[PDB]
């Protein structure tokens, strides 16, 4: 059912596994994510960016998720505002029925990040909603700042900057994350931690995109082994979007290429869903949330 | 608001205009149809085939439409089961919250078509739901059968076969509809009538699809003049699906062609929605439902 984000991530935190947090922008993405969680017996963090909310309308974002939760009532599901940029955005999401919100104030200095995060926390906690915040920028996180930040804000989960970035082009050179920094943040905060920009661009997904004529020149994701190490170091929420988009659109491109007369939307989007679903299933197994319901 | 199908079509019947009945299979199609109705101040007949229902799940089909109706509460909206094939399918749609159902038993002899239609009508009317049925096969409708069929079944609207067929390949030669037969059916039945297979494949939609590298293989739709003539003859519900699909997928193909690196779903489907929306807006104006709310 639909639950406070902390309910899912406190369990992941105590038991030492990661829960993928999967972005969606429409029905097909959402359906594939839920079918993956059903088939792997995994809790689900469903998240929507501000741009996805603008695209769907917040009433449809929440409404579709509530329908899906009722279709799969045995699955723990949190609905999360990804990278909220203002207090007002977070409050709108709380009012609309989100059960988790992120405020990203990491571009501010410590004191202003802490003040704004604390304001969001007060509002969200009064409504029974969990909160995520972010600290560090690609300076990386200062673990002693993280300790104080968490204690004074009462934020439920923290995204510490340790070297990732969003999108398909994460590293110009070799992938590198600061796992010593991660472990220190974890030791000092003892709360669930969040990894942003955690897509891997799996080889089979890349191959499908390229086979269909797509271009991923220069792309580099987070290696599977880095994701596993991140979870071993205390990451409990793993933000995943790019992988889902590439797998989905690879299949759309393939259908377009192989039949110029095909215009039934279902013929494009059923194989697209299947590819997205399979990415999510494999990721749930990798992060350790499979068979946790 | 969400209303019985007869609420919309009795008005169109008495005032002599046509209401497009627009198919959807997902959020993007539905959103574009609604935005068109809002922009043209037109009532909305939203319909879902059995295949679309299998694809979305009937809970999501109804749920998304209810969200959209609450977003645009001033628009009359009916939610219609298109080409229901069994009593049980029609009953499932009634129970899930459809406000109109079609039973297609036109492949049966008159007596069996009447028997099955009457059984659906009894069930649907007991639930406050309107019913569509079909008579004739591409042998065309017998107007005296239509008269008796409507009188005995109490069906709310009738699809009389006058020469259309579904899909892009309607006429292996010159377009032709039996308007004399249409007028006789209308005179004898005095109820709202339905035109199936009513896509036009407009020149600009064909051009967009071909520019995007698609192939329509000699497809020909119902000319705009024939649609207008059919409304003048008493057609009040105009089933439209192919035109929407072609316009939508043309834009998906175009994005895929022009940027091989693009995999943001919204970048494919925002222009696709726009193209679908414009087809619907133009069709509402053509059929006479614009500025009728
Ligand atoms: O960290 C993430 C994904 O990491 P990755 O790119 O590695 O999948 C997410 O929190 C966000 O980046 C999200 O994807 C942004 O979505 P839009 O603003 O709608 O384009
Ligand atoms: O008459 C119609 C549209 O005519 P046109 O093809 O001219 O748009 C519709 O009632 C049906 O044909 C409907 O489109 C079938 O949908 P699926 O079974 O989901 O493929
Ligand atoms: Na987030
Ligand atoms: Na119909
Ligand atoms: Zn992020
Ligand atoms: Zn971030
Ligand atoms: Zn039809
Ligand atoms: Zn038919």
The answer to whether B178 touches B162, Cβ cutoff 8 Å, is yes
Where does chain A break, by residue before each gap (C–N > 2.5 Å)? Answer: 138
Question: Helices B87-96 & B110-126, crossing angle to 10 degrees?
Answer: 20
Q: Which residue in B26, B209, B253 is closest to A27 by CB distance?
A: B26
Assess whether the C-beta atom of A228 lies below 6 angstroms from ligand 1. Answer: no
DSSP, collapsed to helix, strand or coil, labels residue A222 as coil
Residue B51 beta carbon below 6 angstroms from any ligand 2 atom: yes
Nearest CA in chain A to B253: A256
CB A76 within 8 A of CB A68: no
Torsions phi, psi of A242, nearest 5?
-50, -50
Helices (H), A127-232: 143-153, 179-189, 203-211, 224-232
| CB-based contact B111:B39 (threshold 8 Å) | no
CA B57 to each of CA A73, A74, A244, B23, B53: distance values in angstroms, whole numbers, following the listed order:
15, 18, 22, 15, 5
Instruction: Determine the Cα–Cα distance for residues B290 and B130; give it in Å rounded to an integer.
Output: 23
**Cβ count near A266 (within 10 Å):** 17
A241: Cβ below 6 Å to ligand 1? yes
CA atoms of A278 and A246, how far apart (whole Å): 12
Is A287:B283 a contact under the CB 8 Å cutoff?
A: no
Task: Note whether B170 and B164 are within 8 A (CB).
Answer: yes
State how many domains chain B has: 1
Across the interface, whether the CB atoms of B246 and A263 are under 8 A apart is answered yes
Residue given tokens 């007369």 in the structure block? A261
> SS in 3 state form for B84-107?
ECCHHHHHHHHHHCCCEEEECCCC
Residue B9, H or E segment: helix B5-15
Residues in A closer than 8 angstroms to B266, CB to CB, are 25, 51-52, 55
DSSP state, B155? -
As a whole number of angstroms, the distance between CA A270 and CA B55 comes to 8
Q: Are the C-beta atoms of residues B72 and B1 closer than 8 Å to each other?
A: no
- B150 with B191: CB under 8 angstroms? yes
Q: List the single residue in B56, B256, B268 with the smallest CB-CB distance to A27.
A: B56
**Backbone CA torsion sign across A20, A167, B257, A202:** negative
Residue B165 burial (10 A CB sphere; 0-12, 13-18, 19+): exposed
Torsion of CA A54, B34, A272, B206, to 10 degrees: -120
Beta-carbon contacts of A136 under 8 Å, excluding residues fewer than 6 positions away, are A106, A142, A160, A161, A162
What experiment produced this structure? X-ray
**Tokens 């909220």 belong to residue:** A84
Q: What value, to the nearest 5°, has the Cα angle with vertex B64 and ends B58 and B70?
A: 135
Compute the distance from residue B136 Cα to the ligand 8 centre, in Å. 9
Dihedral of CA A211/B266/A266/A202: which sign? positive
Which token pair is A56? 């769907």
Distance CA B263, CA A57 (A): 21
User: Quick check: B63 and A59 CB within 8 A?
Assistant: no
In which element (H, E) is residue B65 found? helix B58-71
One-character DSSP codes across B27-46: HHHHHHHHHHHHHHT--EEE
Distance from CA of A91 to the nearest CA of B (A): 20
- Test B213 with A260 for CB contact under 8 angstroms: yes
Q: How far is the CA of B49 from the centre of ligand 2 (A)?
A: 8
Range of the domain at B6: 1-293
Residue B114 CA to chain centroid, in angstroms?
A: 22
Chain B closest-CA separation from residue A214 CA (Å) = 5
**Residue of chain B whose Cα is closest to the Cα of A244:** B263
**Residues pairing with A21 in the sheet:** A45, A239
In angstroms, the CA A239 to CA A160 distance is 13
Residues 6+ apart with CB under 8 A from A277: A32, A33, A35, A36, A39
Contact at CB, A71 and B51, closer than 8 angstroms: no
Ligand (nearest to CA of A220) = 1
| Pairwise CA distance, residues A270 & A249, whole Å | 11
Ion ligand 5: residue ranges with CB closer than 5 A: A 166, 196
Task: Calculate how far, in angstroms, residue B243's C-alpha sits from the geometric centre of ligand 2.
Answer: 10
Mutate to test the interface with A, among B249, B251, B259 (most CBs of A within 10 A): B249
Q: How many CB atoms lie within 10 A of CB A252?
A: 25
Verify whether the Cβ–Cβ distance B25 to A266 is below 8 Å: yes
Q: Distance between CA A9 and CA A231 in Å, rounded? A: 12
Buried b (16+ CB within 10 A) or exposed e, A276-287: bbbbbbbbbebb
Which atom number of ligand 2 is nearest to the Cα of residue B47? 10
Residues of A with CB under 8 A from a CB of B: 25-29, 31, 51-52, 55-57, 59-60, 63-64, 67-68, 70-71, 209, 213-217, 242, 245-246, 248-250, 252-253, 256, 260-266, 268-270
Least Cα distance to A161 among A223, A191, A145, A90 occurs for A145
Residue closest to B196 by CA, chosen among B229, B152, B132, B240: B240
- Domain CATH for A278: 3.20.20.70
Neighbours of ion ligand 6 (CB under 5 A): A 196
């Amino acid at each position: 059912m639909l639950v406070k984000g902390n309910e899912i991530l406190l369990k992941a935190h105590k038991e030492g596994y990661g829960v993928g947090a999967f972005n969606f922008v429409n029905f097909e993405m959402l359906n594939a994510i839920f079918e993956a969680g059903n088939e792997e017996n995994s809790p689900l963090f469903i998240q929507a960016s501000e741009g996805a909310i603008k695209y769907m309308g917040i009433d449809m974002a929440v409404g579709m998720v509530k329908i899906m939760c009722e279709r799969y009532p045995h699955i723990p599901v949190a609905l999360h505002l990804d990278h909220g940029t203002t207090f007002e955005s977070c409050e709108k999401a709380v009012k609309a029925g989100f059960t988790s919100v992120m405020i990203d104030a990491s571009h501010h200095a410590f004191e202003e990040n802490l003040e704004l995060t604390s304001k969001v926390v007060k509002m969200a906690h009064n409504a029974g909603v969990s909160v995520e915040a972010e600290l560090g920028r690609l300076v990386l996180v200062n673990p002693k700042e993280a300790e104080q930040f968490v204690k004074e804000s009462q934020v439920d989960y923290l995204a510490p900057a340790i070297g990732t970035s969003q999108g398909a082009f994460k590293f110009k050179g070799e992938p590198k994350l600061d796992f010593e920094r991660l472990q220190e943040v974890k030791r000092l905060t003892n709360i669930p931690l969040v990894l942003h920009g955690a897509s891997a661009i799996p080889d089979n997904v890349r191959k499908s995109y390229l086979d269909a004529g797509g271009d991923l020149k220069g792309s580099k994701g987070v290696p599977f082994e880095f994701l596993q190490e991140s979870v071993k170091g205390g990451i409990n929420k793993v933000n995943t979007d790019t992988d889902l988009r590439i797998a989905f659109i690879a299949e759309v491109r393939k259908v377009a290429n192989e039949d110029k007369s095909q215009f039934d939307l279902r013929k494009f989007f059923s194989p697209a869903q299947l590819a997205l679903k399979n990415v999510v299933k494999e990721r749930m197994k990798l992060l350790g949330s499979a068979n946790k319901i």
